[PDB]
Amino acid sequence: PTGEVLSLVGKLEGTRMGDKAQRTKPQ
Amino acid sequence: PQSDLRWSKQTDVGITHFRSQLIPNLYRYIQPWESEFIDSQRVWAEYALKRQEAIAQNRRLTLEDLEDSWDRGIPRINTLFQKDRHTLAYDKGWRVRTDFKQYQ
Amino acid sequence: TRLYLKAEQERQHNYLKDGPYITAEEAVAVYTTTVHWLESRRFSPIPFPPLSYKHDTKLLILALERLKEAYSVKSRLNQSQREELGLIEQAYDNPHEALSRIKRHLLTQRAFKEVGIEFMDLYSHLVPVYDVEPLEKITDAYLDQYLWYEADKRRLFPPWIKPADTEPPPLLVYKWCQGINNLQDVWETSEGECNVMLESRFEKMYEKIDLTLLNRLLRLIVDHNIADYMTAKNNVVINYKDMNHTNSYGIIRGLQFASFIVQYYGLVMDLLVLGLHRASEMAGPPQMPNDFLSFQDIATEAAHPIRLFCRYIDRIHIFFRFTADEARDLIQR
Known part of the structure; x- marks a missing residue:
């Protein structure tokens, strides 16, 4: 398991651009 | 790697070992422009409704109002709660000025 | 850099030899077109700017806020770096003396100090960075805030001119795409109608702006004294390290109000490109002006090839739609 990053091209089929995008609550 | 997810803690009972996978990517935590734009249009129509009905109520919009529309609207709804905001309404042509700041 | 300012000195030299590259009748033509549009x-x-202007104080505070934005919290503070900050906080202390000083500079100051220039090493291209004297920096910053507020109030700038304060550029792209897709039967090619989508650069906009003509055009939309200042402001010597030239053709392009000059000359060229008829149809009647991409009625929209228009700071993006007959007439011409 090398520590170099891998090109995200082809490994993003299971996600959307906003999945896990959360908005903070009022402070 | 799973090998680097192992950690150990020692107490009087002895040494106890624990484990916990992909790192999160920056592109999953920022809303795409399309969803942002449609949400902006929705939220600002909603704010138009709430502001006219609150003007009927003769009150000012509060934090508990619009709280479901906090981080939304391309001119962010949070900008109606800034303190300088009244002076900001006198800052005209700021975007051209920002695109000309790289020049000075 | 040394090579570049040598080239720019030479270019100023060919300008002052050949005189105004623009011809006199070209000047009167553009002046007539702009006065007709206005x-x-x-x-x-x-x-x-009136002495007791209602928002004047707010405009100076905004100008000094913009100036302070440049100075991040840091210990790298030299004599000029500290002098600018000290004068900024001084004007913060007494806004009225700052108003009086900026005003007196407006109605009288005409000869200014040299401006140092350094360059950004973007590996593809080099952009100059102009350093203006702090007193002049404050004066021009306030004048910038004032003129932008007043132009926004009177709506000098029609909706096609970008960038606006209503939408970030990535929303400009989305509005442009939607406006394309919402034209009347824009995607139909049975009869053979063709949509043409042009985009360009307005090559050498900043450099090839004749300052005398810049004076003449801009004398109408503002007071002539303010015009005399800002036009005298681009007749200023440029220096870097040791070799220094006065510039006369190019706008300094680093002044605090260069933005207004560029966006106004862009509107003048915009009248040239569109013609007063189509420009008026895009802008709408002055009582009820349109938004970015829309007309009063679809008949006004389908009256000419140029359906959509959008000028960025110096770019143009035009979307024509032609009938087969119109296309063939243009091709044969």
Whole structure:
């Protein structure tokens, strides 16, 4: 398991651009 | 790697070992422009409704109002709660000025 | 850099040899077209900043906030770096003396100090960075805030001119795409109609702006004294390290109000490109102006090839739609 990053091209089929995008609550 | 997810803690009972996978990517935590734009249009129509009905109520919009529309609207709804905001309404042509700041 | 300012000194030299590259009748033509457009827009010329202006204080505070934005919290503070900050906080202390000083510079100051230039090493291209004297920096910053506020108030700038304060550029792209897709039967090619989408650069806009003509055009939309200042402001010596030239053709392009000059000359060229008829149809009647991409009625929209228009700071993006007959007439011509 090398520590170099891998090109995200082809490994993003299971996600959307906003999945896990959360908005903070009022402070 | 799973090998680097192992950690150990020692107490009087002895040494106890624990484990916990992909790192999160920056592109999953920022809303795409399309969803942002449609949400902006929705939220600002909603704010138009709430502001006219609150003007009927003769009150000012509060934090508990619009709280479901906090981080939304391309001119962010949070900008109606800034303190300088009244002076900001006198800052005209700021975007051209920002695109000309790289020049000075 | 040394090579570049040598080239720019030479370019200024060929300008002052050949005189105005623009011909006199070209000047009178553009002046006529702009005055016709402005009387069609009824526009009210900008008055000189009144002494008791209601928002004047707010405009200086905004200008000094913008200036302070440049100075991040850091210990790298030299004599000029500290002098600018100290004068900024001084004007913060007494806004009225700052108003008086900026005003007196407006109605009288005409000869200014040299401006140092350094360059950004973007590996593809080099952009100059102009350093203006702090007193002049404050003066021009306030004048910038004032003129932008007043132009926004009177709506000098029609909706096609970008960038606006209503939408970030990535929303400009989305509005443009939607406006394309919402034209009347824009995607139909049974009869053979063709949509043409042009985009360009307005090559050498900043450099090839003749400052005398810049004076003549801009004397109408603002007070002539403010015009005399800002036009005298681009007749200033440029220096770097040791070799220094005066510039006369190019706008300094680093002044605090260069933004207004560029966006106004862009509107003048915009009248040239569109013609007063189509420009008026895009802008709408001065009583009820349109938004970015829309017309009063679809008949006004389908009256000419140029359906959509959008000028960025110096770019143009035009979207024509032609009938087969119109296309063939243009091709044969």
